Design brief:
The modification Phosphothreonine is found at residue 84. This is DNA replication licensing factor MCM6. It is found in: Nucleus; Chromosome. Belongs to the MCM family. By secondary structure, the protein is mainly alpha-helical. It has a single domain, classed as Methane Monooxygenase Hydroxylase, Chain G, domain 1. The protein has helices spanning 11-30, 38-49, 56-77, 86-89, and strands spanning 80-81, 105-106. The protein has a two-stranded antiparallel ribbon with strand order 1-2. The longest helix is centred in the middle third of the chain and has 22 residues, at 56-77. It is globular, with a radius of gyration of 15 Å.
Length: 114
């Protein structure tokens, strides 16, 4: 398909998906496969897009979009790879790296729901 064209407008989701593919493509080439704290991805993302924010609505939108994508990723997509339980949830301090846990990993092949 040339495009599906998600009737709603998904340029927002595309910018977030671009973030996913960009972070991962760099990290897989530099180190391994994104892994680590999923929240950090939003963190630095906001730090980048903050420069394009014309208005608070843009910021709010970007935040809720990236969040929805991560929420979707973890539940529906299942393009998330995780190992133990410890660094995955991040509900307790002291998630050890020696335990070979990669925390949250995202598949290089992401997709849309339509």
């Amino acid at each position: 398909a040339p495009k599906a064209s998600l009737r709603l407008g998904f340029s927002e989701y595309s910018r977030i998906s671009n973030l996913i593919v960009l972070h991962l493509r760099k990290v897989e080439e530099e180190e391994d496969e994104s892994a680590l704290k999923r929240s950090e991805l939003v963190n630095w993302y906001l730090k980048e897009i903050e420069s394009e924010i014309d208005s608070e609505e843009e910021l709010i939108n970007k935040k809720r979009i990236i969040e929805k994508v991560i929420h979707r990723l973890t539940h529906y997509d299942h393009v998330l790879i995780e190992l133990t339980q410890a660094g995955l949830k991040g509900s307790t301090e002291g998630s050890e790296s020696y335990e070979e846990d990669p925390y949250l990993v995202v598949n290089p092949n992401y997709l849309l729901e339509d």
